[PDB]
């Protein structure tokens, strides 16, 4: 369960790697067993930090009128998420 949340956080970081959007996204909301990958659903929201920034997303304020994405797929507790913009 702590591994879970932490892996979601790592997925947000990787999304920020594979991105070419201008700004870092950060976790907005986290929605709802042998070792097999675990299903994740969460949202992310755009921040005021430009994308090439070694500051963790969580130190970056959310951007007013920042795009929101709903992300779904899996994580291993030890990439395969697609995000689509919320309307």
UniProtKB/Swiss-Prot annotation:
Residues cleaved off as propeptide: 1-87
Location of the region described as Disordered in the Swiss-Prot/TrEMBL record: 31-44
Locations listed in the record: Secreted
Major place of residence: secreted
A single GO cellular-component term on record: extracellular space
GO molecular function: lipopolysaccharide binding
GO biological process, one term: innate immune response
Cystine pairings recorded for this chain: 49-60, 71-83
Keywords: Amidation, Antibiotic, Antimicrobial, Disulfide bond, Secreted, Signal
Superkingdom of this protein's organism: Eukaryota
The protein's role, per its UniProt record: Microbicidal activity. Active against E.coli, Listeria monocytogenes and C.albicans, in vitro.
Family note: Belongs to the cathelicidin family.
Protein name, per record: Protegrin-3
Organism: Sus scrofa
Name of encoding gene: NPG3
Full protein: residues contained: 31 to 128 of 149
